[PDB]
Design an enzyme around this catalytic site. Structure first.
Site, PDB file in Angstrom:
ATOM      1  N   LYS A  89       0.029   3.835  -2.872  1.00 43.82           N
ATOM      2  CA  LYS A  89      -0.976   4.880  -2.703  1.00 43.82           C
ATOM      3  C   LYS A  89      -0.370   6.273  -2.562  1.00 43.82           C
ATOM      4  CE  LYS A  89      -4.724   2.080  -0.796  1.00 43.82           C
ATOM      5  NZ  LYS A  89      -4.013   0.834  -0.429  1.00 43.82           N
TER       6      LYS A  89
ATOM      7  N   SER B 157       0.774  -1.253   0.000  1.00 44.42           N
ATOM      8  CA  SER B 157       0.000   0.000   0.000  1.00 44.42           C
ATOM      9  C   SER B 157       0.812   1.315   0.000  1.00 44.42           C
ATOM     10  CB  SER B 157      -1.015   0.002   1.140  1.00 44.42           C
ATOM     11  OG  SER B 157      -1.830  -1.155   1.086  1.00 44.42           O
TER      12      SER B 157
ATOM     13  N   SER C 229      -6.162   3.153   4.200  1.00 46.59           N
ATOM     14  CA  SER C 229      -5.588   2.512   3.017  1.00 46.59           C
ATOM     15  C   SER C 229      -6.664   1.801   2.180  1.00 46.59           C
ATOM     16  CB  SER C 229      -4.465   1.541   3.426  1.00 46.59           C
ATOM     17  OG  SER C 229      -3.678   1.170   2.307  1.00 46.59           O
TER      18      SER C 229
ATOM     19  N   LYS D  96       2.891   6.313   5.837  1.00 48.57           N
ATOM     20  CA  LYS D  96       1.999   5.365   5.179  1.00 48.57           C
ATOM     21  C   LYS D  96       2.501   3.933   5.356  1.00 48.57           C
ATOM     22  CE  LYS D  96      -1.588   4.167   2.641  1.00 48.57           C
ATOM     23  NZ  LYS D  96      -1.505   2.773   3.181  1.00 48.57           N
TER      24      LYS D  96
HETATM   25  C1  LIG Z   1      -1.953  -2.360   1.667  1.00 45.26           C
HETATM   26  O1  LIG Z   1      -0.651  -2.903   1.946  1.00 45.26           O
HETATM   27  C2  LIG Z   1      -2.687  -3.297   0.725  1.00 45.26           C
HETATM   28  C3  LIG Z   1      -2.104  -3.258  -0.664  1.00 45.26           C
HETATM   29  N1  LIG Z   1      -2.715  -4.577   1.133  1.00 45.26           N
HETATM   30  C4  LIG Z   1      -3.883  -5.222   1.309  1.00 45.26           C
HETATM   31  O2  LIG Z   1      -4.972  -4.696   1.114  1.00 45.26           O
HETATM   32  C5  LIG Z   1      -3.827  -6.675   1.754  1.00 45.26           C
HETATM   33  C6  LIG Z   1      -3.895  -7.529   0.488  1.00 45.26           C
HETATM   34  C7  LIG Z   1      -3.878  -9.030   0.750  1.00 45.26           C
HETATM   35  C8  LIG Z   1      -3.330  -9.817  -0.441  1.00 45.26           C
HETATM   36  C9  LIG Z   1      -3.051 -11.279  -0.087  1.00 45.26           C
HETATM   37  N2  LIG Z   1      -3.078 -12.072  -1.304  1.00 45.26           N
HETATM   38  C10 LIG Z   1      -1.700 -11.449   0.550  1.00 45.26           C
HETATM   39  O3  LIG Z   1      -1.630 -11.558   1.793  1.00 45.26           O
HETATM   40  O4  LIG Z   1      -0.689 -11.482  -0.188  1.00 45.26           O
HETATM   41  C11 LIG Z   1      -2.749  -2.152   2.969  1.00 45.26           C
HETATM   42  F1  LIG Z   1      -2.173  -1.283   3.810  1.00 45.26           F
HETATM   43  F2  LIG Z   1      -3.937  -1.701   2.613  1.00 45.26           F
HETATM   44  F3  LIG Z   1      -2.890  -3.302   3.610  1.00 45.26           F
END
Ligand SMILES: *[C@](O)([C@@H](C)NC(=O)CCCC[C@@H](N)C(=O)O)C(F)(F)F
Ligand SMILES: [Mg+2]
Ligand SMILES: [Mg+2]
Length: 466
Positions: free
Chosen positions: A52, A49, A298, A410
């Protein structure tokens, strides 16, 4: 005192939690330009994230702080003495914060304009963006969860955090042996229900699973909820967010005394409509206010909607291909070297994203001296702040340390991917930093990240609150 710092971060980076991990760590004094610390800063890593940061800055360059979003209700012509219209259109133009309350207020406006009967069908128009719902390399197993919601121009945002394209499932125990009660939330009568869940004996084990099977609009609830257990609520995504918005709008109309005689579906305002009558509209809050729930918590959906909104402004194409180039140009136009960047989405959910820690720090500098700098930094989580709308993803981290109340950064977290980037404001100078971990095996190396962020706050001259 600068050597002491280098020794301290070196020691923090030998933590056994970083076994088999590549970690980019860069710290820069923005007042001087002095590179205080650099380790693998040019190495390309997944940002999670932290992507972002790039998206947000680009949105403020392309769309501006004053930018708001519109939703409107349209018919071929106004209603008459009998107050009848044929087909009605809910047209969405990328509002990431459109609540059910706002749909109600638009239903009331449709009633107050003289419409009593919608004689034809009601259509959800989300053609302002394309109909590509998910990024190519997003994992199908993720699809039931809020952070993996489908992307649409017309979507309903849930709650004060504005989680888009989802519905709240609530499961309540009954009597032992009786099925659990399932409440689909907004998607009631939109999504299908497959309730196999039962109420277990008092004090038994909670085994409740709430799923949406890939490629369906069905909520499958399985397992057992104990009779004495608290109700279980979970946000789950739906198929076709605009169609859900359409569904919720019919209910809003019917509740404001407007009978819909037809069906609800997708469809764009027809081209042969000479002069469409706007029967209701809604304007969102401005981007500066929207940035807060977006960056603090996020929000993935917000990021992808912003990218496609960039695609509309720069190219008139609500498209990932257009918006991502739009992001790249905006960053370049800002003075950021985009050599190490690979942009595959706005949210950072894509494992096809690549940043370097140097590029992040580069962006933090350029963002700091930009006209929108204050609305930019106001959006970043603040270390250790109780208020969720201030602390954000950092609310329960770094409390009782020199970082509490001071460090604005962030976060970014997936499997084998963790990141923390932002500012350490000190009296002499504002510090900027990036910490990106890839390849680690345990849980996010948050202790490592916190230790560094705290040490930098101490360096900037801060002390722990007591
Ligand atoms: C950010 O880091 C976003 C991009 N991450 C997520 O929303 C978690 C996504 C999970 C993906 C899953 N396949 C895994 O664990 O690899 C933030 F801050 F929003 F978490
Ligand atoms: Mg809720
Ligand atoms: Mg319903």
């Amino acid at each position: 005192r600068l050597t002491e710092l280098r020794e301290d971060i070196d020691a923090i980076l030998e933590d056994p939690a970083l076994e088999g991990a590549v970690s980019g760590v860069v710290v820069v004094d923005t007042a001087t330009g002095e590179e205080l610390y650099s380790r693998d800063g040019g190495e390309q890593l997944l940002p999670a994230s932290n992507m972002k940061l790039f998206t947000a800055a680009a949105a403020l360059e392309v769309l501006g702080a004053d930018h708001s979003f519109g939703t409107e209700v349209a018919a071929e012509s106004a209603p008459g003495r009998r107050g009848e219209v044929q087909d009605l259109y809910l047209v969405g133009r990328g509002d990431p914060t459109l609540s059910a309350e706002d749909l109600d207020a638009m239903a009331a406006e449709v009633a107050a304009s003289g419409v009593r009967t919608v004689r034809g069908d009601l259509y959800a128009d989300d053609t302002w963006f394309d109909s590509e719902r998910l990024v190519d390399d997003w994992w199908p197993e993720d699809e039931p969860y809020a952070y993996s919601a489908q992307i649409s121009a017309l979507t309903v945002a849930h709650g004060e955090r504005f989680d888009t394209g989802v519905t709240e499932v609530s499961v309540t125990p009954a009597a032992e042996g009786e099925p659990a009660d399932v409440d689909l939330g907004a998607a009631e009568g939109y999504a299908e229900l497959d309730n196999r869940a039962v109420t277990g004996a008092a004090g038994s084990a909670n085994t409740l699973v709430i799923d949406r099977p890939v490629g369906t609009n069905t909520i499958a609830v399985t397992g057992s909820l104990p009779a004495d257990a608290a109700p279980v609520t979970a946000l789950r995504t739906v198929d076709e967010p605009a169609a859900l918005a359409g569904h919720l709008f019919e209910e809003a109309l019917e509740s404001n005394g407007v009978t819909v005689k037809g069906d609800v579906g997708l469809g764009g305002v027809p081209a042969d409509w000479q002069d469409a009558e706007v029967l209701a509209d809604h304007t969102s809050a401005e981007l500066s206010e929207i940035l807060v729930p977006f960056m603090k918590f996020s929000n993935n959906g917000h990021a992808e909607m912003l990218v496609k909104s960039i695609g509309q402004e720069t190219a008139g194409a609500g498209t990932w291909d257009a918006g991502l180039v739009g992001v790249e140009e905006a960053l370049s136009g800002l003075g950021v070297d985009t050599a190490g960047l690979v942009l595959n989405d706005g949210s950072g959910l894509s494992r096809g994203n690549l940043v370097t820690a140097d590029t992040v720090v580069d962006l933090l500098g350029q963002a700091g001296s930009a006209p929108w700098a204050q609305t930019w930094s106001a959006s970043l989580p603040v270390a250790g702040e109780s208020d969720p709308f201030v602390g954000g993803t950092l609310a329960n981290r770094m409390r009782g340390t020199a970082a509490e109340g001071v460090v604005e950064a962030k976060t970014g977290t997936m499997s084998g991917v963790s990141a923390l980037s932002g500012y350490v404001p000190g009296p002499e100078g504002e510090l900027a930093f990036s910490i990106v971990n890839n390849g680690h095996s345990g849980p996010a190396p948050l202790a490592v990240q916190d230790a560094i962020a705290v040490r930098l706050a101490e360096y900037a001259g801060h002390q722990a609150p007591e």
